[PDB]
Design a protein around this ligand. Structure first.
Ligand SMILES: Oc1cccc(O)c1
Ligand SMILES: Oc1cccc(O)c1
Lengths: 196, 195
């Protein structure tokens, strides 16, 4: 049935996440994942065409969780520049602390597309907000959104293979959207609201 | 000696580029490539472990050619901002007009590392100069250069799906501390022909 497939995909996603969180997205095979979901190994490809799709579902789950948490806290700040900066700083910190996250930004070339499906609409919103209040200067909204995540990935990959890294990165993104060079740094250094 | 091994590698690179420039990166296999280099299909793996390494070498060849060209023109301008902007615009224009380039950005996950090792040092140089001059405001030179290419890739991928090069360059200027208002002006000045 289609209902059986529905819950199995869900169980596989849960299995993959639990295992990768412990050992790394790169150190878990589908045999172990199918075991965790309680199904025959040779039956995996009955729910996912390949490994990548499953990886993407796990990444969506991770990014969406933070996205929702960010929408709960951050947006409650008045300065659009702080909302955007704070959001970015949380992503960077999560990347340097979550085993599974670091794995997404390195061993996954589809990180960008996933980030765009889940956090893109949120970032665009935050940027549009800053544009409407004259806080930001942006010529193309979609470009700023996609470049932000392209930069995030590169930024996290560098940091991972190496401290206010999050602050420095956020400042650069603030400057990219039209914030005075000196002001940007200050805004990216404001106390960061707890995300947990 | 293994000197022939080196010659073959070079011939394979030449073959892949010629073929991919006419048919597109994704429509050319080991079969066609080895044929252009005049060797058997199977012997391919005696020169490259995978098709991916050859693809990277072809991209290196294309990025280096433009890098060298830029080093002999753009760098002659007096405004560091315009040197950086113009260089980025050439990269965007090539990406949208050259069949082979489009393929590197939407058919190769190693785009960033290849760009970073060939153009990275060049962009970093131009950014440092602009930092010396006080034209830019950058806290971490490596971060700025790796972010520029991260952005370039994303920007090109989007475009590939009227003056997009100017807009991209302006945003990068803004990212490095250039006044939002004067950024678009600099990014719209006549572009010096690279070749
Ligand atoms: O959820 C997000 C992610 C990145 C930037 C932002 O403003 C919001
Ligand atoms: O060769 C390059 C490529 C991109 C930016 C730059 O300043 C130089």
């Amino acid at each position: 049935r289609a209902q059986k497939r529905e819950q199995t995909r869900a169980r596989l996603i849960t299995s993959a996440r639990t295992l990768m969180a412990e050992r790394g997205v790169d150190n878990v095979g589908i045999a172990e994942i199918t075991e965790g979901a309680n199904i025959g190994t040779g039956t995996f490809y009955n729910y996912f065409p390949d490994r990548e799709q499953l990886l993407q579902a796990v990444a969506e789950d991770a990014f969406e969780s933070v996205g929702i948490a960010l929408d709960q806290v951050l947006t409650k700040l008045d300065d659009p520049a702080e909302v955007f900066a704070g959001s970015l700083r949380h992503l960077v910190r999560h990347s340097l602390e979550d085993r599974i996250w670091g794995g997404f930004f390195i061993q996954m070339g589809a990180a960008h597309p996933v980030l765009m499906r889940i956090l893109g609409p949120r970032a665009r919103r935050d940027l549009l907000h800053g544009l409407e209040t004259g806080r930001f200067t942006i010529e193309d909204l979609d470009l700023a959104t996609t470049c932000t995540f392209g930069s995030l990935i590169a930024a996290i990959q560098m940091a991972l293979s190496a401290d206010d890294k999050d602050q420095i990165f956020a400042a650069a993104m603030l400057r990219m959207v039209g914030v005075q060079a000196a002001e940007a740094r200050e805004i990216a250094s404001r106390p960061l609201p707890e995300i947990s």
